[PDB]
Amino acid sequence: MDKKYDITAVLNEDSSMTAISDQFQITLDARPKHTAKGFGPLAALLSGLAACELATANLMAPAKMITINKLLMNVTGSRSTNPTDGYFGLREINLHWEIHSPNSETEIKEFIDFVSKRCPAHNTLQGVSQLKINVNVTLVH
Amino acid sequence: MDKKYDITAVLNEDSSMTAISDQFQITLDARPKHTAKGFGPLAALLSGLAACELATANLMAPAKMITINKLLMNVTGSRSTNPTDGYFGLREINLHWEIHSPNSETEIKEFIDFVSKRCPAHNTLQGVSQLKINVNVTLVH
């Protein structure tokens, strides 16, 4: 319980929402593409996940001896709007790693498994069960 | 499985990351307050949750006859950096609604139980169980 987080989001008029963290501000919107003003709520959560993925990898790399030249993740997910389950949440979330690294395959493999076990966000969503996280990586030498 | 999401985060130099959703861009930085460039991974993640809450509250209000004048949510959470659990994810997440509404308490109480059982984010995280989500609201007339 060492790391604490304190966030606050406000519903502005025109139904757009602005979030605040320390002195930073993000504006979110659940309205469709053709009119919004920032990330959908779920978009941001998924980006919050991606960022945790990249960050913990960048932090573990040195100890695992992986040298990274380019790192990026593409996240995709889906949920039901008219569920039978009563499960309005994410049912499937897909993480696609793209690593530009001179390190070997088996190396990159164990590395990522390590990061997945290490990123807080991943740890969190790992315990859902109504959710499925699919991971695959593209190693570019 | 009607709503799909596609996000892509990238690790820039200076260890900051930038996410992209359609034509929107948010930079996320996991460095400490003194050094940082945007939201922390989890901070945005929690914001994404917060914004889903507000967003769904705003979409359910009409059907519930709840008239909302001001709506905002303060989210706080925590995790271990040195766990014995092996769990590095969020152990607790506190949601505090502040609603300015002429509706009665019992009315806001039932409205929130509903918004809760309905925001995708909230549903997703409800399924965790190494995580405790405490909800409390401040109704302002």
* CATH label of the domain that carries residue A95: 3.30.300.20
DSSP assignment of A81-123? SS-SSS--SEEEEEEEEEEE-SS-HHHHHHHHHHHHHH-HHHH
* A48 and A115 assigned to the same domain: yes
Do the domain assignments include residue A34? no
Q: What is the largest CA-CA distance in chain A?
A: 52
* B12 and B56 assigned to the same domain: no
A47 and B28 within 8 Å at the Cβ level: the answer is yes
* B18 and B68 assigned to the same domain: no
**Number of alpha carbons in the 13 Å side-chain half-sphere of residue A131:** 26
Length in residues, chain B:
141
Closest-approach residue (CA) in chain A for B30: A55
Number of domains, chain A: 2
A1 and B125 within 8 Å at the Cβ level: the answer is no
Distance of CA B45 to the CA centre of its chain: 7
**Residues 93 through 112 of chain A touching chain B, CB cutoff 8 Å:** none
DSSP state of A3: E
Token code pair at residue B105:
């308490």
Instruction: Give the CA dihedral A124, A130, A136, A137, nearest 10 degrees.
Output: -30
What's B21's domain CATH number? 2.20.25.10
B47 and A9 within 8 Å at the Cβ level: the answer is yes
CA distance B54 to chain A (A): 6
Rounded distance, CA A25 to CA A81, Å?
29
**Structural domain that includes position A129:** 39-141
* B31 and B78 assigned to the same domain: no
Token code pair at residue B39:
């939201």
Are residues A15 and A41 in contact, defined by beta-carbon separation less than 8 angstroms? Answer: no
CA distance B106 to chain A (A): 22
**In the 3-class helix/strand/coil scheme, how is chain B assigned residue by residue?**
CCEEEEEEEEECHHHCEEEEECCEEEEECCCCCCCCCCECHHHHHHHHHHHHHHHHHHHHCHHHCCCCCEEEEEEEEEECCCCCCCCCCEEEEEEEEEEECCCCHHHHHHHHHHHHHHCHHHHHHHCCCCCEEEEEEEEEC
* A10 and A66 assigned to the same domain: no
Do the domain assignments include residue A15? yes
Instruction: Identify the three-state secondary structure at position A45.
Output: helix
**Residues 30 through 59 of chain A touching chain B, CB cutoff 8 Å:** 30, 33, 36, 38-55, 57-58
* A80 and A132 assigned to the same domain: yes
* A109 and A141 assigned to the same domain: yes
* A58 and A23 assigned to the same domain: no
Are residues B56 and B126 in contact, defined by beta-carbon separation less than 8 angstroms? Answer: no
* A76 and A54 assigned to the same domain: yes
Beta bridge partners of B135: B95
Q: What sign does the CA torsion over B111, B107, B64, A28 have?
A: negative
Closest-approach residue (CA) in chain B for A37: B24
Closest-approach residue (CA) in chain B for A129: B127
A72 and B10 within 8 Å at the Cβ level: the answer is yes
Rounded distance, CA B55 to CA A29, Å?
8
| Nearest-by-Cβ selection for B19 from A4, A5, A51 | A51
B115 touching A (Cβ < 8 Å): no
Beta bridge partners of B28: B17, B39
CA distance A92 to chain B (A): 9
Token code pair at residue B8:
């892509």
Token code pair at residue A118:
């290490």
Instruction: Identify the three-state secondary structure at position A4.
Output: strand
* B74 and B124 assigned to the same domain: yes
* B101 and B121 assigned to the same domain: yes
